[PDB]
Task: inverse folding
């Protein structure tokens, strides 16, 4: 947030590249623990209905 | 908003749109005078700088809100 | 032109809490359950009914904003099953009525039923004809006038604890006249088995009772059953005695 | 002119949910699940195919109603010059759908919702409207479709109660002749099931109930 | 009788009389359903069977 | 040609409902379940492996109608100057479906739908699609009553021989159900009802 | 931000089984159908009603605990420097439920499910304890139902009435005197005083 | 407009996620009650 | 090569209905439920564990036929010059599947279906209709140790003056202690492979 | 790197089926509903609740072996230039689980199956068929007091002239005070879990 | 507050749209303002797109 | 197509203004029919799929 | 008789009298279904069987 609110960091290209990495790993991280929780709770309903 | 970035060029100069017309009114009267020809090239060439710096800044701002609206969805 | 989008956007926010109040009445009623209704037009009906009864104006902002959302749904669902269990009162005793007459005549001793389904459907239609659906909507339109959310109204526990015997004393007196003749006939048959020892009147008791247990109830089926159905329909005037808002 | 096209696509997306609510498809669908339930069969006759046969008759009745929408909206003089006549034009476009709702819905149940929406609108001080509005004044389209769909559930349940009767009279006499013998520990639903299927095919209820519903909305010759 | 359609057609560089002479020289001239229009102009009116 | 790409797609997305409603698949899929309910079974074999074999049996008798529609619509005379001759031309392809439908539908019910002989003109495709399906469901019900009947007899005779003895409080489902399926495999009833179902529409 | 959304959505998904296993809904649901089974009529009062009453009463116990969790969580001063300091704060929110849960469970499985207090040790100890408390109260309600059938079948041997069925006579007798003692409002109110200060 | 549309870009979207959230919770809300009433 | 990917994808999509129709899963998944209600016990093992063993035993018998066509698809010399020469590789890679289908089906039923080396469409309705016939009588035979036992205990009920008695709750433990003394769960598992191994 | 992630995603999909089939959970969920059919009750105590208590016990004992799968796989020694040692590496990751399946399955059935140290793919049906076979023994053993109860209640009724009444009503009290005074709820549950872990 | 110091350079070029030094500094402003506005719109967008995917997953 | 393959019409600037029109009239028409039918075949899908 | 198709077509630089000589020299000139039209024009009208 303050990478992009700082205007000095958004003008340099190689600072954009490490933030581009920083955006992309944010998406893969919280999505991995999302779906694995979804599949974690996806395994619980069927056994209890049985 | 887009009127105000246009009107800042109409407010920042006083009567340049009329200043070129009264100049060429004098140019079409006697198009053979050195003080009248030299003053016109200093006055004709300032107008073409003015309008493309009127239309290009709104052009770069046109696609910028168009970039804003497509990122709604 | 931003507020026009907000008017349709305040409505769809308003319908979610409206869905949570009246959806488990659409599970309880005999002419509205999942056995009688499909999946595709079910969720269309339940949304637009709550849009016609919502007490606040639709274009205004709802007072829902970030107060307490996960406990609010369990509030509105808990009062919803109350409106379901009061409205399904006379159908429950009627379905309870047919099970007693079914159980006394035999016909259920394979445990250690179709007839009781028949009376529950019958009291559904005779309730629906005269008025009917006008009083099912009126009690939930008044329910929003006395149980508006962000106020935490509750179903008022100390008159709730007599609800089960309230339908039970309506169950026993409705099954009163047919169980006395069937029981008196058995001991009258039993006195003949004492007068003729090898009759095996237990076998004879099963053949004769199903005709008797249905015949005596034909005499008061016409003039007595269908008016108690309309009398036992819970009306909107009693809505004050079952609720109160907490702040 | 261009945003009139936006109104068409926005009309296009909410269409089958209007068919879920606005038309008489809700009458055909309910009684066909009930004849599945009254016969005692649970999965068969596989109600995915029963959706298709209930839809095709309802479109077949609704077709003269929806066909008038094309001829009203393909007119070359849609564009007016005033803001109220064009909104008047879409009202007189919607009236052919609207009076069909007036004819087949209940009187007082629609009438309850305008009185219920006005006290929501202004407050209690607005005086209530009685039955006598019906001769001159028309209600809104959003106070109609609640009371329509509940009323058709009442009429469909009137039908669904009636053909439940000639099968359950069978289901008690089988449970009594089984107890006329000493056969108490026997499942009577497996004996009632043959004579349950004959009473619909000997009566041929399919080819006369299907004809009965079309006379309740339209006529022949 | 319910399939009769009609049309109006403008010709830019030929008149009605020699187009009628096209119908008389070919054999397709039908005196029951003639062409309605001014005798030397571009516009006229047709009505008849769809074939 | 480009508009015909729509109609080729328009068949395909609506294909699993017309085969759900406009062919003899409904009769095969209905009798294969009540034979389970005749034996007193609930989940045996499935609802999945019974739908699979019902699909292939209907794929026999429906494919030759479907086969002629390719070669008829592959032909080179699709350029026509007239609207109505192409309207005749696409009507001439579907008559294979029409002769299949008229053969098994009731003539009286489709005249009722026509109000809201058949040699001069064929009746409309929407005028007989419920009438075919409403006749098959009655006939599958009618043929469903028939094969229910011998299994009624084994349920009754063993219930009477237990009452012939003194043992009246005994659930006969644990005894009849062994005797139930031996009546169906010594008859070899599975392999023979599948034969005549093919012979009911397509001759040998 | 969004990591709060996963837990606050999964609570709604796992809710149908916390009611099925974590609260006093286990004790309430069982004893109703058992005394219905005491009377022998399996479709009165048609267990959806019996499952209707015991859900609302078990709603009333979880409800102060439910309101107590998010009053505490309303304080948005949760963000700090240490990774365990936010962990202790979310643990402080769950001790309101744990103090309910530590009260009723025994001292035998809870350390047995910690060597092999923790939260995951208490729920199977809880539901096992509640069934054992449910059976002996149902048993004490059972004994006045195993004396009233015993006397009516005795008078048949006192007379010459041995060969008739006694269940067709005793079952109407068992229903009338139970409602004449107004028992359905008795065993309900005898249960709600145990968990909370009801009403 | 560059600052007003941007702060309005979030203002439309957050109220849209909230309205979708309150409707899905009602589905698992009443759906937990539906399965518990069948029990 | 591009539409070979369609064929590799066409097999993978119809495969949950291939397994529902083509393999011996419809032999396996029936006898385990038929033994379940044979004990008089309704749902108590699962509807997944019985499904879990029946899928997993079936993957043993169908894997060597799949692997032979696997090395045929893995082989690169499938491409030729002519049309029928291309079809020369599909049937030879397919022929190993259909010998098992011919082996456990009746010929005259296949010879019936040829009016519409036999083809696969003539064997699939012949397969399952012959498979469930053979599965019923072996499910009938395991009923026989459990039909004598509830009759004899009802006799000793009738040998006393106990005409009002439920015999199901006494025979039900006897219905299963005979099965563990038989150890039928090993016995039935070994028998369904000897048809194939 | 991404081949490691698709395998874990494949594990999350099959995860309900492994706990349904592969572990000792089937020994739990069978014997819980076995007591319910032993008592003669049909819907009490309503197996939705009983499915909860069977899951938490079996999950409690697999977690220490499941924790071994992390510390084997979260390490940095996975970079092997030769492909065969890494194959033997992932053989050694599951070795604690593989040792667990070998301890509770019969020997000769496994070698019959891998005829087609033993393969993990082969022992999976050999574990469950032994597990249900061990489950039917404790299905038989816990039932065994109650058959003595069902006969003794008929004899005292037959000692009177009370022969028309069914003893199902009189069998069930003494079919439960032999459970709560014995306190079998803690006896079976502790006995089933001590077979595996040690305190 | 970046838009403030953008909007303070337009007026001096408005009075003099022929100064070579001012338009050189203005292009360094306006292209840098171009980089600021769409970056902020696109970056909030990912924060918008991924939360709806979770409720799409859990519904 | 024959307006475009006729090489006299493609060179005249008077005719080019029509040529941009007709490619747009073909573009909007078939795309409109594509989306109405897709909603048409999608609307029936929601009732029978259940 | 229900399969008769009709169409009208124009020619640029061949007349009707020259096209009709192609039919006689080939052997396809049918005197029962002739060509109706003006003798030296571009347009003419043909109707008959589809082959």
Result:
């Amino acid at each position: 947030t303050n990478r992009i609110e700082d205007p000095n960091l958004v003008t340099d290209p190689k600072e954009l590249a490490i933030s581009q990495e920083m955006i992309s790993d944010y998406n893969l991280y919280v999505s991995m623990v999302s779906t694995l929780t979804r599949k974690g709770v996806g395994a619980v309903e069927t056994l209890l209905r049985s | 908003y887009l009127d105000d970035v246009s009107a800042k060029f109409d407010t920042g100069v006083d009567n340049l749109q009329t200043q070129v017309t009264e100049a060429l009114d004098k140019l079409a009267a006697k198009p053979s005078d050195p003080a009248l020809l030299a003053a016109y090239q200093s006055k004709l060439s300032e107008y073409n700088l003015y309008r493309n710096a009127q239309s290009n800044t709104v052009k770069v701002f046109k696609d910028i809100d168009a970039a804003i609206i497509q990122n709604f969805r | 032109f931003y507020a026009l989008y907000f008017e349709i956007h305040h409505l769809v926010a308003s319908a979610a809490l409206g869905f949570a109040r009246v959806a488990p009445i659409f599970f309880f009623l005999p002419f509205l359950n999942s056995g009688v209704l499909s999946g595709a037009p079910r969720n269309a009906i339940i949304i637009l009914v709550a849009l016609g009864v919502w007490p606040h104006a639709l274009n205004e902002a709802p007072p829902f904003l970030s107060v307490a959302m996960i406990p609010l749904v369990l509030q509105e669902a808990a009062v919803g099953v109350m409106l379901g269990c009061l409205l399904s009162w006379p159908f429950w005793v009627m379905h309870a009525l047919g099970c007693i007459i079914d159980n006394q005549r035999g016909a259920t001793l394979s445990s250690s039923s179709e007839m009781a389904n028949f009376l529950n459907m019958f009291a559904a239609v005779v309730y629906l004809q005269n008025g009917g659906l006008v009083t099912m909507v009126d009690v939930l339109n008044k329910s929003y006038q006395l149980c508006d959310p962000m106020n935490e109204c509750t179903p008022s526990l100390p008159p709730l604890l007599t609800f089960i015997n309230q339908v039970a004393q309506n169950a026993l007196v409705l099954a009163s006249p047919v169980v006395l003749v069937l029981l008196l006939s058995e001991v009258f048959l039993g006195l003949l088995s004492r007068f003729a020892p090898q009759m095996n009147a237990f076998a004879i008791s099963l053949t004769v009772k199903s005709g008797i247990a249905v015949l005596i109830m034909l005499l008061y089926f016409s003039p007595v059953l269908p008016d108690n159905v309309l009398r036992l329909s819970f009306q909107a005037t009693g809505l004050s005695s079952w609720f109160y808002e907490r702040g | 002119n261009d945003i009139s096209l936006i109104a068409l696509l926005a009309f296009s997306t909410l269409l089958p949910f209007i068919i879920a609510s606005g038309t008489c498809f809700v009458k055909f669908s309910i009684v066909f699940v009930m004849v599945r339930n009254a016969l005692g069969l649970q999965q068969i006759p596989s109600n995915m195919t029963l959706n298709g046969v209930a839809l095709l008759l309802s479109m077949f009745v609704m077709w003269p109603i929806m066909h008038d929408a094309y001829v009203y909206f393909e007119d070359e003089d849609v564009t007016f010059n005033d803001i109220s006549s064009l909104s008047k034009h879409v009202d007189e476009g919607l009236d052919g759908y609207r009076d069909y709702l007036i004819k087949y819905s209940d009187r007082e149940l629609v009438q309850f919702f305008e009185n219920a929406q006005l006290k929501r609108q202004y407050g209690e001080e607005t005086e209530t409207v009685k039955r006598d509005k019906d001769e001159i004044e028309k209600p809104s389209i959003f106070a109609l479709l609640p009371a329509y769909a509940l009323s058709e559930i009442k009429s469909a349940f009137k039908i669904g109660f009636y053909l439940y009767l000639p099968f359950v009279v069978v289901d008690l006499v089988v449970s009594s002749v089984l107890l006329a013998l000493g056969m108490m520990m026997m499942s009577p639903v497996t004996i009632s099931t043959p004579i349950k299927l004959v009473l619909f095919v000997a009566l041929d209820g399919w080819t006369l109930l299907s004809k009965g519903l079309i006379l309740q909305y339209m006529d022949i010759a | 009788a319910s399939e009769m359609r009609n049309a109006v057609v403008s010709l830019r560089n030929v008149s009605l009389n020699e187009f009628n002479n096209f119908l008389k020289r070919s054999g397709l001239y039908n005196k029951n359903y003639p062409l309605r229009g001014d005798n030397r102009k571009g516009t006229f009116y047709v009505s008849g069977p769809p074939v």
